[PDB]
Design a protein around this ligand. Sequence first.
Ligand SMILES: COc1cc(C(=O)NS(=O)(=O)c2ccccc2C)ccc1Cc1cn(C)c2ccc(NC(=O)OC3CCCC3)cc12
Ligand SMILES: Nc1nc2c(ncn2[C@@H]2O[C@H](COP(=O)(O)OP(=O)(O)OP(=O)(O)O)[C@@H](O)[C@H]2O)c(=O)[nH]1
Ligand SMILES: [Cl-]
Ligand SMILES: [Cl-]
Ligand SMILES: [Cl-]
Ligand SMILES: [Cl-]
Ligand SMILES: [Mg+2]
Ligand code: NA
Lengths: 996, 123, 209
Amino acid sequence: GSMEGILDFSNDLDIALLDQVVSTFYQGEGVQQKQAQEILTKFQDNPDAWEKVDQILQFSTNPQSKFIALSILDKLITRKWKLLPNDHRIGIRNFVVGMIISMCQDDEVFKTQKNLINKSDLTLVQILKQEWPQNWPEFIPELIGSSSSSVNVCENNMIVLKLLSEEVFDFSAEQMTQAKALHLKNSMSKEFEQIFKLCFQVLEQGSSSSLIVATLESLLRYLHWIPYRYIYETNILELLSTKFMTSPDTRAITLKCLTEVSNLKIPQDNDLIKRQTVLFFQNTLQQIATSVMPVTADLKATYANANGNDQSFLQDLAMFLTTYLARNRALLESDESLRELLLNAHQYLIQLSKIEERELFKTTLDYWHNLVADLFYEPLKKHIYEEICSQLRLVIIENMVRPEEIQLYKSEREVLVYLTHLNVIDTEEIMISKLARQIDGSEWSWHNINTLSWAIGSISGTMSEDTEKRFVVTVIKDLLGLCEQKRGKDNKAVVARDIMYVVGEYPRFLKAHWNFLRTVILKLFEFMHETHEGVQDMACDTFIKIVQKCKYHFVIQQPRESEPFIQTIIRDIQKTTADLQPQQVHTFYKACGIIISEERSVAERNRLLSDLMQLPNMAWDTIVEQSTANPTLLLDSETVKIIANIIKTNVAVCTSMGADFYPQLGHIYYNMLQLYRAVSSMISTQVAAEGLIATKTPKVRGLRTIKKEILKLVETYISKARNLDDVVKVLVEPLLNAVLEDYMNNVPDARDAEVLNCMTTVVEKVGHMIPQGVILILQSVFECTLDMINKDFTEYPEHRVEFYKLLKVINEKSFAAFLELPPAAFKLFVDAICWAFKHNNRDVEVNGLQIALDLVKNIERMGNVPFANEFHKNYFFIFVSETFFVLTDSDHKSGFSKQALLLMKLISLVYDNKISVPLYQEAEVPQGTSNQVYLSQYLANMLSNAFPHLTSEQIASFLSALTKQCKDLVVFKGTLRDFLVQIKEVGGDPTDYLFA
Amino acid sequence: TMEEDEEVLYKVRAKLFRFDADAKEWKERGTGDCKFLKNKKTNKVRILMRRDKTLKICANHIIAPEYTLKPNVGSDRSWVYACTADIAEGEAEAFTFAIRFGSKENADKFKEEFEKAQEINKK
Amino acid sequence: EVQFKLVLVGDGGTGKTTFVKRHLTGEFEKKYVATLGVEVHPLVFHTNRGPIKFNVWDTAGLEKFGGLRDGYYIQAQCAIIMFDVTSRVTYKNVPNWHRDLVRVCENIPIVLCGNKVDIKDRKVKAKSIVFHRKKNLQYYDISAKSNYNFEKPFLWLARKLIGDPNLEFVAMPAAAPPEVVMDPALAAQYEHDLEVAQTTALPDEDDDL
Ligand SMILES: COc1cc(C(=O)NS(=O)(=O)c2ccccc2C)ccc1Cc1cn(C)c2ccc(NC(=O)OC3CCCC3)cc12
Ligand SMILES: Nc1nc2c(ncn2[C@@H]2O[C@H](COP(=O)(O)OP(=O)(O)OP(=O)(O)O)[C@@H](O)[C@H]2O)c(=O)[nH]1
Ligand SMILES: [Cl-]
Ligand SMILES: [Cl-]
Ligand SMILES: [Cl-]
Ligand SMILES: [Cl-]
Ligand SMILES: [Mg+2]
Ligand code: NA
């Protein structure tokens, strides 16, 4: 209806209508809300909308309207301000200041319209960034003066100064040129003496808590940059650590201030300052103990209860204690009069560490890691913390997570290891007594036996072998007794899993006790017949874990055995693995592969490998025979599954054996590649008969799984091969004949991206030895893959990634293959590289930029010959402009570093005169002209057309800086970032590019 | 919950999809425990399916005797059927559902149980 | 029933809209269609304390589609800041989103969510993620795709807004479903529709479910 009226600028603005649109957006629903939304967005983005702001701010009764008005004004101020005549800029500045003071002098508005005041204050700060101090030298004197006139104005002035400090020191890095950031920082620094005097007077004179809070909020920001003397050489440390900690209104902000105080840069060789640092800590902790809670308080309970701002307060306390102590605890450690303070502070941290809050726990854990690492190394310090450390052992053990949570488990483990070293007896006692509480039922639960088991596992290798032996026996006895005790398969399986877990984490014990190791393995084999969920997986997981650690014990003849145990495992493998799922079987064969690779006699290794692969090889032989006798039999769902599982078993064993796998690969290689062809035929046939939908069917997916596992097997072997001559002589040619034409001659939807991945490994490992093979790879995959991925950025995401990985390695190892391309195809190669630059997908973009870099390097290497000169004449400017596009378009920020590196290379080539021919074509410039002069001219023209709001002076200064800095990446990057700031506004200072 | 009056005949982990016809694509509706619930008053068997995490209802309809489980071209562990009145999102609506399981065995068992329920519902 | 305005902010492509849609309908949208300005949807959870409604303001992360920007934050009662653990830039920008948000909403519960933890090659490591600590934000690793910690942001905000630390999500009640008769007139209609559905493959046939 009427709502679209506000978009008609040919008429004057109906404020009552704007207020309705705004109301409908903020308070309305469904269709109405959505329409109002679109209307407001178009209003706001109208480039003349700013002209309407004055009108809206005066005549609107809707504070949300005024908010959006200030948004519009902010766009003008940050982007187009310097276009305005001085008179207009002063007009706007005065209007904004006037509106702020007016809203502050009205108590009702000040109380109820905080949103609009804060937005106004931010708008003022955007003006200061443009105007101050050069065009507004009196701003700070006037603000200071206006502060005494009213408590509301004074309070609001603290919000302005806070926002200013944030914009200049905290968020300037990305939003201003280096020169402008330095200018504003020096300006604030120069006037800070006066600003501090005001803040200090307010904090001393007191009274209004809202004023005091706003003042401390600004101080928090000041502490990021001000010199220490403003804190240490005034009374302010005392005020923060006494007065402001006692009242709860000021306590949260004060704690955060004192945390930052604890991070100030401070003289290290000064006893007065050391005493002051001690004193503010003592004062803060005394105020906590007397006004908030004693050292004994149950912070776990308090946090859980979540009353008022208790959670935030306790978080902030943890941050303050850990920050201060990590820097200053040595100040507290040698003076006997500070011992109680030191231990009380750490006791608070023990209590905070018991809170059930993952992220808070991690904060305290980082501190505990710092402390116990110190006590491990620092002489005469561990005895101080004995009782702290004892409590901490219990906290860590009760909070141990599964090793799957890698960072947190790692952190916890390291703390427990250090603590175990500091007192092995205390650790053992705590673990044994926690175990006893599992056995007596008082703390029994799955979670609790699990967490205890993870804790017990985590300290493997910390005790002496003798102590560990007694400990491990005690633990396994106790868990075994626990297992007997428990009734029902659920309970028994939980404990049995925990037994398996603990045993797997103590290889040193297994390695010393062959009798026990054998029993464990045989028990694991028994468990591989238990269908109760989780048991078979843990049995298999434990088996391979033990094998990874104790493999040598399976390959030697243990005394009182008739043979190496690997022989025993292999002999019984059918029976052992009969009830396992395919993936579990694969883990089993992988584990056996680990063992067999320990056998360094070749004949014996090859015989073991032969014996291990017996059942897969016999299944394979029967299938290959029957399958080739009758190509029909491959249509059978069940055969396809058997075949896939045979190939997967080969992959699993090749994964653990690498180079040692070759004789097995040799047994299957030729028939495996025949199967690849036969399966490929069926897939082709099925897609013809049924359509692209065929590729979704279980049968065709089964067939493709066979192809992908074959490629995975070959990739796995080649990636670990030692005999590259055999790879080239025996493997490569059949592989290329089997896979390349099939890839090329399938429709896009039937092409396997795994082919590209396999070829990448081939080029990586033996590319230098197969120059004709690399050419054949490019001819087969290059144009047809590019055509799949050059219509948009989304289709065929795996092909996309693998394609640029392949081109990267070819460009690294066999650049000669790109020299052999016809001009038109070489052009497609350059097109492909620039296409990768334009990707948002980071895998592609990064490979794209690296290929470009490497390609420039490869051309440079050729020296002064026709191909190199033709490359530069044809492509130098394409690379320079394509690189500038992705640098400046704001849609490719993750690639900034590599874009900069590339641009620096390209500019340095011309600055060093390393390009032999003119880059300009005849009759375009005086014929003697240097490439440096022409590059300057071309970039000036290119940037002028792309960014017409820049002055000639801005562009010329930028380019001058760029070319002078093309041997200094960090400075060059600074210049690029300065340019990215300047293109987002009008009237950027050209002298900014002289920054030093 | 309003499930206290009902016996649990069959339970199985499943992912449920509804066919959007506007765009010719399947859209997930939920993942979690699919349950066949026999009302102890009426002896009527319904499918009730709740999402993991939120326990919100993604399926709630009678196992009508006239429904037929059909294979999907893409899967050996899924069924598709028309449902004329599902009340997961309040208002009874018609949907083309697809339900997928962890295995062919689960899918075949489901089919067996669905037919048993259809027979129960015929009384 | 009590309702709370929730604003969702973070870089383009981090998973904001995907996360909300999954919560609304159960669907996982694989395509990236950049939000234009804001999308507003009601989202209800059933709790032991009764139903809680979030008015979800799912804002645009891309500068060019930003619309009203901080104008969307007015009268927000809670927020989620989202980034992508596979994209370092998205975490680098978390302080920028937080800055803009708290200047408008000074005293609200906020969850920081690292999305896409299902992806194996994680680029923002756990050890790097510390920004929430001094800002008193809750943090969760999440995946809109795997549903890892899917409900955690809303459960935590619900506890904060209701002021009850033992608030639980409960099973929404399940009414007896109606019997209907098959319409003889729509018999041919359903044959067609079922034909098309059967011959359209289900997505992600390699997943566990
Ligand atoms: C090799 O003597 C065993 C080994 C095992 C064994 O390996 N068990 S298990 O695979 O982990 C497992 C997991 C879940 C359920 C069931 C089982 C069996 C079991 C029993 C025994 C006999 C036994 C009975 N008592 C009450 C015990 C108390 C402690 C230990 N310690 C141990 O003698 O160590 C070594 C020291 C010198 C050589 C052996 C053993 C035992
Ligand atoms: N792997 C993975 N992908 C995800 C996940 N969540 C979302 N995505 C995908 O990542 C993209 C995120 O898209 P959106 O949710 O629209 O992103 P957005 O944050 O709303 O973006 P803007 O609206 O532009 O701010 C889509 O392609 C999603 O399918 C996740 O948990 N894991
Ligand atoms: Cl300075
Ligand atoms: Cl120290
Ligand atoms: Cl050894
Ligand atoms: Cl999914
Ligand atoms: Mg979005
Ligand atoms: Na105006």
